[PDB]
C-alpha cells in the first residue's frame, strides 16, 4: 500500500485526462467544418480509439494496484485542470490550434508522471511511456496542419 | 430551422445521456468485483460500443440538422439530470441494481422523445426507435442477473 | 393490387433517382480536382456503394409488389429528376455545391414519398425512412465542405 | 404491464411461427430434388439463418417484456393454427408452391401484429416491420421460381 | 436397401432428437436468469449451432440412403418418446439440472444407434460416433456447473 | 496531345458502353424469373461488379490522358450502343438471348478499339485486352444456358 | 513392412481413383451446358477440392507407410479400372448420369477397402471412412438432379 | 470458326501440359525426401494452385471459343509429348533437376504458342503471356536450388 | 463406473505423453540450429499446436468420464515415457533422430490404447484414432529429413 | 560474454516459471467446476496463450544470448518455484485462491529479475517489464473473484 | 542469352528507379505539411507498396534471366541518372510538384523499355506494361492536386 | 529544443541505417541460392517489413521533434559510415555471414543511441529499445544458420 497508493493517485489524474481527452477529441470531430475536414476526421478516429483504450489500461492498473478508478463525468471535472474545450462549430484551423494546446498539457503532464514513477513503479511507468509515444505523434499531425509552409 | 431547432435540442439531451452512459458503463466495468464479474464485463463491453456509436449518430444528426453538438464533460453535467453514478468498487448485485435504475431513466427519456418526434422528424425518431431496442434489451440482461429465481 | 400499384409507381421514381444518383456521384468522383479532392473521393466511394445498394432494394421491393422494375438509361432520363449533371473537370467546391442541390431534391422527394406511403405500405415506407437518414447525413458532409456567405 | 402482456402474447404467437418456419425451411431444403434444387438450396440457407435469428430476437423481446418465451416443440403445436408442412421428397415446383402459401400466412400474421402493436409498443412493432421486409422479399424469390 | 431402410429409420429417430434438442437449447437460453446466466449463454450458443448442424448431417444422410427425412414440428412429436422440456424462466441450476437429464437420453440413444449401425452402416455409425463426443463433452460442462 | 485525344475519345465510347452495360445487367437481374433464375442471378452479380470496376478504370484512364470523362445518363444515351433494353419481367432464356446479342456488340467494339490502340497507346490497349477476356468469358456462360436450333 | 505393404497397395489404388476423379470432375465442370449448369458448377467446385485434398492425404499416408506414391498420368491409367470419362460438351442430364455411374464404382471400391483395412490398419481405414461420407453425399446430390419427381 | 478453331487446338495442347504439370508437381511434392525438402514443399504448393487455376482458364477459354476441352487422363497422355515423370522416392537434387527439365519444355512450348497466337487471338495470347511469367519464375526458384555457389 | 475408470486411467497416460511431447517439441524448436533449421521450425510449430490441443481433448474427456485430469509437472515425470530429452543446442539431424525415437513410443503407446479401448469406449478410441493419424504423419516428416545407412 | 551469462541464467529461471505456469494454468482450467467456472475458463484461456508466448520469447532471448534454453519437464521441476500444484477437481475460489499465491511468487520473481537486469541488459529487462504488466493484471482478475475476510 | 543480358540490363536500370522511387515516396510522406497532407499520406501509402512490390518483381525477373539484381544504396547511385529528390519539410504543393516531375522520368523511361523489350522479351515487356498503368494513374492523382 | 536537436540527429543516423538495411535485406533475398534459400527467403521477409516500419517510426519521430527526416538514397550515402553491402549471387552461407556482420553494427549503433537517449529523451529511447529486441532476435536466426 506504501507507494502503490501514490502511484494509484498519479494514474487517476491520467485517467480523467484521457476520458476528458477522448470526449473532447470526439467533440471536435463532430464540430469541424471546412475544406480539409475529412482529413481531420480521418486523423481523429484512430486517436479516439487509442485514447479510449489507454483509459481502460490506466483504469485497470489503478484497480490492480488496489484503489477504485473513477470514470464518471463528475470525477472528470474534479480531477480536470484543463478547463473545458470551448470551440464549437468551427474550422480546421481553430480546432487544430485549440487541440495542439490541449496536447501541450497532456504531454507535459505525462512526462512529469513518467518522471515521478521512476522510483515508484516501473510497470506503471512503462505504461505511460508507451502512451506518450502516440500522444506526441498525434500532436505532431495536428501541428503539421497548421504549417502552410513551415 | 422551424421544428429542426426543436428536434436538435431533443437530440442534444440524448447525446449527453449517451456520453454519461458509456462513461458510467465503463466505470462499473472497472469497479465490479465478485464471483460472476466476468459475465458482467462480457455484457458491458458490447453495450459500451453500441452506446458510443449511438453518441456519434445522435451527434452527427444534430450537426446535419444545423446545430452544434456538445460532447465535452461540461455539457454532460449541464444537460445531465441523473446525478452522477456513485457506486464504486463493489459487487455485481450493487452495480446491477444501480444500472437498472440508470436505464429506467434512459429508457423512459427515450420513449418520450420518440413520442415527441412523431410530428417533428420521422428520421430522427427512427434513429431513437432503433436505439431503444438495444437500450431495453440491455436493461433486461441486467435485470436477469438480479433474479435468483424470478 | 391497387395501392400496391401506387406504391410500386412511387418506388420506381425513387429507383430512377437512385440510378441517376450513383451515376452522377461517380461522374463527379472522376472529375473532382484541387488540393483537397481526395477528401471528396473518400467521401463519395461509400455513398456510391450505399446508393447502388438502395436501388437494388427499391427494385426488388417493386418486383416483390408484382411490378417490373425499370433500370435502363432510357427509363432514368424519363422519370428524371435534375438537369443532366453539367459540371465536368472542376474544383471541389464547384462540384460539392452542385451535389448539394442534387441532394436537396432527392431528400425532398424522399420526404414526400415517405408521407404518401404513410397510409399505403409501412414496409416500403420503412425502406425510405432508412434511406433518408444516410442520404441526409451525406448532404451534411457535402455542406460541411462549404461555408461561404457568412 | 397490462398493455405489455398483450405485446408478449402477440410475440409468442410470432415466436412459434418463426420456429415452425425455420424447421420447415430446413425440411424443404432436405427434400427438394430436380434439375435446379441447388439454387433453392442457396436461397433457403440465408433465410433459415435470418428466421432463426428472428426467433431469437422475439424470444428475447418477450423476456424483456417480463414474460417467459416458449420455444419447445410442444409450444409450437400449442400456438400453431396452421397445418404441419406436408410435402416430402418432391420437385422444386411442389415445395416452392407450398412455401408460397406458407409465407402468405406468415406475412399476413406479421402485418396484423404490426397493426396491433401500433398503439401498444412502437419498439416491438419496429422489430416486426423489419422482419416483414425480409419475409416478403423471400416470398418473391419463391414466387419468381413459380413463374416458369 | 432393406438394410439401409433400417439405417434411415434409426437416423430419423436421431434427426428428431437433434431438432427437439436445438429448440430446447434455445429455450433454456431464453429463460435462464441468475448471477451467472451469461456464461450458460456462452456455453449453449456453440452447442446450438453444433446440434443444428448435426440435424443437417443426419437429414442429408437419410436422403442419401434414399429416404425422405422429416423435420417439421409434427415429425418431432411423432418420433419423440420423451416429454416436452418443461422448465420456464428459472435459475441456471434448474435448467442445467433438467438439461443434464435431457442429455442422458440423447447420449444413451446415440450409443444404442452406434451399436446397431455397427453391422449395418459403418459410415452412418462414424457420423454418430463423431456427434457423441461433442454431446458428451457438452453434458460435462452442464454437470460441472451443478457441482457447486 | 493529339493521339492522346483520339485514345481518350475511344475510351469514352467504351466507358458509356460499360455504364449502359451494368445498368442493363442489373435491369435483367431484377427482372429474370423462371425455375432457374437464381443461377442467372449468381452469374450476373460478379459481372456487374467487374463492369462497374472497368468503367472506373476507363474513366480514370481518360482523365489520366487529360480529358474529362463523361458518366451522366445523357452521356450514355448519346454515345449509346444498343436499343434501350426492352425485356422486362421475363424468362431466363428470353433475357439471356438478349444479353447474348448485347455482348456481341460490346466484344466487337472492344476488339476494334484494341486494334486501333495497337499503334496509339499500349497501356490503354492492355486495359481493354484485360477487359475483353472476362467480357468474352461472360458471353460464353450466357450462351452455355442456351442450346437450341441444333 | 508386413501388412503395411498390403495397406500401402490398397491406398495406391485409391490414390489413382481420386486423381482420375478430380480430373474427371473438372472435365464435366468445363463441358456441362444447358439451363441448370450453374448449379452443377456450384456443386462440383467444392467436391473437386475435397477429392484433391483426399489425394494428398492418401498419398502422404502411402509415404508414411514406407512406399512411394504415384500421381503421374501413367500411374492413373495403369491403376485405373474405370475406363476414361467419355462424355464431352453435353447437358446436365448426360453428365450427371455418367457421374452417378462413376461414383458407384468409387463408393463400392471404397467400401471394400474399408472392409479390407479392418484388420490391417485402423488409422488408414478411418481415413477412408471419412472420405466415404463425402463421396456418398456427393453422389446423392448428383442423383437428386436426375429425380424430376422421385 | 476460322482461326478460333486453330487457337482452340493450341490451347488444348496447353491444357494437357498444365494438367500433366500439376499432377507431376504434386507427385514430386509427395516423393521428395532429404534435409531441405520442406522448402521444396513450400515452393511447390503455390505453383500447384497457380497451374491448376491456369488449367481452368485455358479450359474455359477453349469452351468460350467453341470447342470442347478435355481434362481426362486419356487426353493428357494423347496430347502429352513429355513422356511421364519417372523419378520417385528421391532427394531434392534429383527431383529439382528433373523438374527444371520439365519446365524447359513447358516454357519453350508456351513461348511458341504466344508467338503463334500473335495473329490469331490477342486475348488468348495475353492469357498465355501471363502464365509464362509465373512458369518462368518458378523454374528459376528450381534452378536456384541446384546452384550451391552459382 | 468401472470401465470408465480404466478408460480414464488410459487417457491420463496419454495426457502426460502429450504434455511431455509439446514441452519436448518446443525444447527442440529453441535448440535446433544448422543450415536448414528453419525447415524444422516450420515443421514443429503446427505440431505443438496440435499436441497442445490433443492434451486438451484428452484432459476434457477424462473429466467427462468423472475423473480429475492431472497436468502438473510432477504428474508428467511420474507417468513419464522417455528419458528427459537430452539434446540441447544441436544440429537438425541430431534433433530429428531423437524426435523420431520419441515418436516411436508415442505411436506405439497410442496403438495399444486404441486396441484396449476397442471394447471399452468407442468415443475415446475414436479420439486416439484421430490423433494417431497426425502423430504418425509427423514422424514421417521427421524421418523424411533422415535418409542414411542406405 | 560474462554479464550475458548471468542474464541468460536469470531468464532460464523465468522460462521454467513460465512453463510450470501454463502447465499449472491449464491444469486448473480442466479442474475448475462450480456455478461460475466458465467465467474462469474465459479468464484463463488468453493467459495460457500469453504465458506460452512469453516462454517462447524468454527461450529465444536466452538463445540469442548464446546459451541453450532448457524446456524439458526435468528442467522445470529442477528450477521449480512452487509446490507441484495440489488442487484437483475443485471449486472456483479454491482454485483462484491457489492461483493467487502462485502469481505472488511469479510477480515477485519478475520484480527482482527486473531490478537485477537494470544494470545488465535493458532489452531483456524491457521483456520482463512488458511481461510484468499482464502477469500482474491477471492476478488482479483472480483476486477480483475473491473478496472475503472483510 | 546475349539477348537476355540486354533485358537484364534494362531491368536493373528499372530496378534502381523503383528503389529510389519508393524511398522518395516515403520521404515526401514524411515531409508534407499543410491543411491537406493527410490525403497525400493516404495517396502515397498504397503507391509505396505497389512500387516496393514492383522492385521485387523486376529483381526476380533479373535473377530469372540469369543475372544478379542490385538493390543496395550504392547500386541506386551507380544506375541513377536523375538528381536526388531535394524537397524537405514543405507544402503539399511543393512535393506534389516535384513528384510530378519525378514521375515524368519514371514513366518516360518505362515506355522506352517497353519499346525495346518489344523485340527482346515479350514477358519482361508485359511486366513493365502492367507497371506503367499504375505509375501513370498515380501521376494523375498527383497532378489533380496541382490543379487548384 | 537544443536537447531535442540532439535526439533528432541521432535518429537520422538511425533512420539511414534502417533504409540501407531494408534495401540490403531485399538484396540478399534476391541473391541467395543453394539447397535452403527458401527458408532464408521466409526469414528475411518479415524482417524487411519490420525494418521498413521502423524506418517509418523513426522518421515520424524526427518530424515530431521538429526536424525534417531524410530518406533519399543521397541521405543514406551521406549518413552511411559502413560499406555498401557487396555480396552478389551467392550461397546462403555467404550472405548470412555478411549479414551477421551487418547486424553487429546495426545493433552496436542502436545500443549507443539507447545509451545517449537515456538522459535526452526517454520516449525516443523506448522506441529504439523496442527495435533492438527484434534486431538482435533476427541476428540470432542468421547465426543459427551459420552453426552448421
Curated annotation (Swiss-Prot), chains A, B, C, F, G, H, I, J:
* One cellular-component annotation, GO: cytoplasm
Enzyme class (EC, first level) = oxidoreductase
Keywords for this entry? Answer: Cytoplasm, DNA-binding, Iron, Iron storage, Metal-binding, Oxidoreductase
Q: Which residues bind Fe cation 1?
A: 29, 56, 60
Biological process GO annotation list? intracellular iron ion homeostasis
Q: Where in the cell is it found?
A: Cytoplasm, Nucleoid
Instruction: Specify the domain of life of the species encoding this protein.
Output: Bacteria
In its UniProt record, a GO molecular function of this protein is: oxidoreductase activity, acting on metal ions
Function, as annotated: Protects DNA from oxidative damage by sequestering intracellular Fe(2+) ion and storing it in the form of Fe(3+) oxyhydroxide mineral. One hydrogen peroxide oxidizes two Fe(2+) ions, which prevents hydroxyl radical production by the Fenton reaction. It protects DNA from hydroxyl radical-mediated cleavage. Binds DNA with no apparent sequence specificity without self-aggregation nor promotion of DNA condensation. Is unable to protect DNA from DNase-mediated cleavage.
Task: Please state what the annotation says regarding this protein's domains.
Answer: 12 di-nuclear ferroxidase centers are located at the interfaces between subunits related by 2-fold symmetry axes.
Q: Quaternary state and partners of this protein?
A: The 12 identical subunits form a hollow sphere into which the mineral iron core of up to 500 Fe(3+) can be deposited. Homododecamer.
What is the protein name for this chain? Answer: DNA protection during starvation protein
Q: Which organism is it from?
A: Mycolicibacterium smegmatis
**What gene does the UniProt entry assign to this protein?**
dps
Amino acid at each position: 500500500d506504501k507507494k502503490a497508493s501514490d502511484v494509484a493517485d498519479l494514474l487517476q489524474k491520467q485517467l480523467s485526462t484521457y476520458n476528458d481527452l477522448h470526449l473532447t477529441l470526439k467533440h471536435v470531430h463532430w464540430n469541424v467544418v471546412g475544406p480539409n475536414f475529412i482529413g481531420v476526421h480521418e486523423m481523429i478516429d484512430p486517436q479516439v480509439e487509442l485514447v479510449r483504450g489507454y483509459a481502460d489500461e490506466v483504469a485497470e492498473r489503478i484497480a490492480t494496484l488496489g484503489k477504485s478508478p473513477k470514470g464518471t463525468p463528475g470525477a472528470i471535472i474534479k480531477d480536470r485542470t484543463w478547463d473545458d474545450y470551448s470551440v464549437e462549430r468551427d474550422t480546421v484551423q481553430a480546432h487544430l490550434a485549440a487541440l495542439d494546446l490541449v496536447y501541450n498539457g497532456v504531454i507535459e503532464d505525462t512526462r512529469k508522471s513518467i518522471e515521478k514513477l521512476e522510483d515508484l513503479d516501473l510497470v506503471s511507468q512503462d505504461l505511460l511511456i508507451a502512451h506518450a509515444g502516440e500522444l506526441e505523434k498525434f500532436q505532431w499531425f495536428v501541428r503539421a496542419h497548421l504549417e502552410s509552409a513551415g
